[PDB]
């Protein structure tokens, strides 16, 4: 496919502990600057053949011929997926992340919010 | 008398305002994290359609 577009806030990348992936975090990011600055450079495309010039001039011939239509004609596969548990490793470990978490300490918040009220009598 | 009053202000606000910082932290770094995460993968499978293509042609 394309490119994905994910943007990474590499401070708040690593920091993470579901504590199985911390480690995994510092090792991830430079795992992926390997395969970062792999992609970013791969030449896009590839040249092909003057078909028609090795046509004439390969005299174990028709090959070139062969090669043209078959080579032309024959197609790819595109590289498997291993782990992308991460779209829901996510998701999942998001709500533990955001809201589960998130609501507990905004509960634990507002408490001393509501005592430094009373701290203000 | 004021000491202990605003001793307990300062533990207060702080504990809060840790925590609503240490909350929205791990929401936006996961958020992070999945960018690239995805990232990290397809990048090289294109890629290696990409140069695969010269290659086999080659």
């Known amino acids: 496919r394309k490119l994905a577009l994910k943007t990474i806030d590499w401070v708040a990348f690593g920091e993470i502990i579901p504590?199985?992936?911390?480690?995994?975090?510092?090792?991830?990011?430079?795992?992926?600057?390997?395969?970062?600055?792999?992609?970013?450079?791969?030449?896009?495309?590839?040249?092909?053949?003057?078909?028609?010039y090795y046509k004439a001039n390969?005299?174990?011939?028709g090959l070139v011929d062969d090669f043209e239509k078959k080579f032309n004609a024959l197609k790819v596969?595109?590289?498997?997926?291993?782990?992308?548990?991460?779209?829901?490793?996510?998701?999942?470990?998001?709500?533990?992340?955001?809201?589960?978490?998130?609501?507990?300490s905004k509960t634990r918040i507002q408490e001393y919010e509501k005592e430094l009220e009373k701290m203000r009598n | 008398?004021?000491?202990?009053?605003?001793?307990a202000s300062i533990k207060q606000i702080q504990?809060?305002?840790?925590?609503?910082?240490?909350?929205?932290?791990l929401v936006q770094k996961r958020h992070y994290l999945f960018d690239v995460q995805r990232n990290n993968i397809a990048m090289a499978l294109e890629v290696t359609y990409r140069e695969r293509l010269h290659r086999v042609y080659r």
Do not use: G, H
Not at chain 1, 58 to 61: D, E, L
Not at chain 2, 1 to 7: A, G, I, N, P, R
């Open chain 2, 1 to 7: 008398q004021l000491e202990e009053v605003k001793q």
């Open chain 2, 15 to 25: 504990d809060a305002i840790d925590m609503e910082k240490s909350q929205q932290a």
């Open chain 1, 19 to 52: 504590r199985n992936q911390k480690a995994v975090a510092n090792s991830l990011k430079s795992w992926n600057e390997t395969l970062t600055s792999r992609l970013a450079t791969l030449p896009e495309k590839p040249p092909a053949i003057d078909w028609a």
């Open chain 1, 77 to 104: 596969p595109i590289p498997e997926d291993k782990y992308t548990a991460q779209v829901d490793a996510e998701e999942k470990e998001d709500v533990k992340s955001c809201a589960e978490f998130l609501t507990q």
């Open chain 1, 58 to 61: 390969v005299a174990k011939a």
